[PDB]
Structures are given as C-alpha cells and as structure tokens.
Design a protein around this ligand. Structure first.
Ligand SMILES: C/C(=C\c1ccc(C(=O)O)cc1)c1ccc2c(c1)C(C)(C)CCC2(C)C
Length: 232
C-alpha cells in the first residue's frame, strides 16, 4: 500500500512535468526539412531553447520525488547532472510518431528525422531514432516512464555523493514498484524496460563530445543550463 502510494506519486510527478503526445497540438516547420546539413542555426536556437525548458521541468520532476528533498542540495545537484541527459533523451523518444518518422517537443514542435539531425543531433540522430523505435514495442505508460526516469535519477553509486547509502535506500523501493506495476497492468517486460537504462546511458555518454562539437560550430554561446548539465 505504501508502494502503491509511491507509484502513484511518481506517475504524477511525471504527468505534471511532461505533456503527453496525445494532449499536445503538433505544429511543423519547413526549415531544412529534406536535406541534411551540418547545423541549421534556426533549428538549433529553437531546440536549445526547448532543452532549457525541459531541464527545468526535469528538476521539478526530481523535486516531486518522495525523499529527494531530503537529500542535501549537493547530492540533489550531483544526481541531476549525472542523469539529466538520460532523462531528456527518454522524454523526447517517448513522443516518437513512427508513421511520420518525427519526434515532438513539449510545445508541440514536431520535427522529422532530418530536422532532428539539423537541429543539433547530427551523427547521433539515427542512434536516437533507433532507441525510440525499440521503445515502441514496450508500450509504456506514464507511471512506467516516470518510474524509469526516477530509477535513472536516484542512483546511489554516483561519484561525489555526500550520502551514497541514503540514496541507495531511496532507489530500493523503485525497482519493486516497477516490478509490481508491470505485472499488474500488462501480464518479460521487467528486464526489457530495465535494459533500456543501459541503452540510455550509452547514448548520453556520446553527449560530451557532441556538446564540444556544437560549441565549436555555433556563433553564440551554449545555453547556461545545458552548459551546467554537461559541465563536469
Ligand atoms: C534530448 C535533448 C533535449 C530535449 C528533450 C526533450 C524536449 C521536450 O520538449 O520534450 C526538449 C529538448 C538534448 C539536450 C542536449 C543535448 C542533446 C540532446 C544531444 C543528445 C544532441 C547531445 C548534445 C546536447 C547539447 C548535450
């Protein structure tokens, strides 16, 4: 009952900070829609702008997680910076429309693969779409996506944690919660969803070089929160 209570709370934290694809008004753009280019600055400006907003929403999601507030701000910051890209990647991949081969952002902006590539994903584009495509068969809902996000976040083995053991105990209930929910809702889903964390980490790891490359390409400055996120 306390685990059913935790599950409902995580689902809510997610739903409140992440607009569903079905509850969003999709809109497109014709900017470099059919030709891949190094970087479309107009798409980068819009994309990076939305990235900043989503990062803020991720911090809000984290704050809504039971116990997170309890940890020290130092630990809150370490956990967030280590898992933010993972979560940003999972979020955009959850708004993938296979028929149109597009992904939709929080404000309804819907870009095709080419535009995703041109907005900044570059050489990581196909890798991201493949992750999104492999996500579909799992048919996950708000609570599973939220529990997965929380599992990516609450990791007590992150380096520089002031209270690693306290973090471990906060994640302990998460795996069980997910275990139980998966079997109560749609009766091998447990390990398949968990394996995705690895795929996720693998992709976010490629972000370190990507940001350096983008910085070298843009005429302006890298948005402060993105900077802070990969600044480590
Ligand atoms: C995945 C991402 C940003 C993002 C995710 C979701 C929304 C939304 O509105 O729902 C908006 C933006 C992102 C952010 C930064 C970076 C990347 C992706 C890649 C993977 C291209 C590597 C380089 C940096 C700049 C770190």
């Amino acid at each position: 009952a306390e685990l059913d209570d935790l599950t409902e709370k995580i689902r809510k934290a997610h739903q409140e900070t992440f607009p569903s694809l079905c509850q969003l008004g999709k809109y497109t753009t014709n900017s470099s829609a059919d030709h891949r280019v190094r970087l479309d600055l107009g798409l980068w400006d819009k994309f990076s702008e939305l990235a900043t907003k989503c990062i803020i929403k991720i911090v809000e999601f984290a704050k809504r997680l039971p116990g997170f507030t309890g940890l020290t701000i130092a630990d809150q910051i370490t956990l967030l910076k280590a898992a933010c890209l993972d979560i940003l990647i999972l979020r955009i991949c959850t708004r993938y429309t296979p028929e149109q081969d597009t992904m939709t952002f929080s404000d309804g902006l819907t870009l095709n693969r080419t535009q995703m590539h041109n907005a900044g994903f570059g050489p990581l584009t196909d890798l991201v779409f493949t992750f999104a495509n492999q996500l579909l068969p799992l048919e996950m809902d708000d609570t599973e996506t939220g529990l997965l996000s929380a599992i990516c976040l609450i990791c007590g083995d992150r380096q520089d944690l002031e209270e690693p053991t306290k973090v471990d105990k906060l994640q302990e209930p998460l795996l069980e919660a997910l275990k139980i929910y998966i079997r109560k809702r749609r009766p091998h889903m447990f390990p398949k969803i968990l394996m995705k964390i690895t795929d996720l980490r693998s992709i976010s790891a490629k972000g370190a070089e990507r940001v350096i490359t983008l910085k070298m390409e843009i005429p302006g400055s890298m948005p402060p929160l993105i900077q802070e996120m990969l600044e480590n």
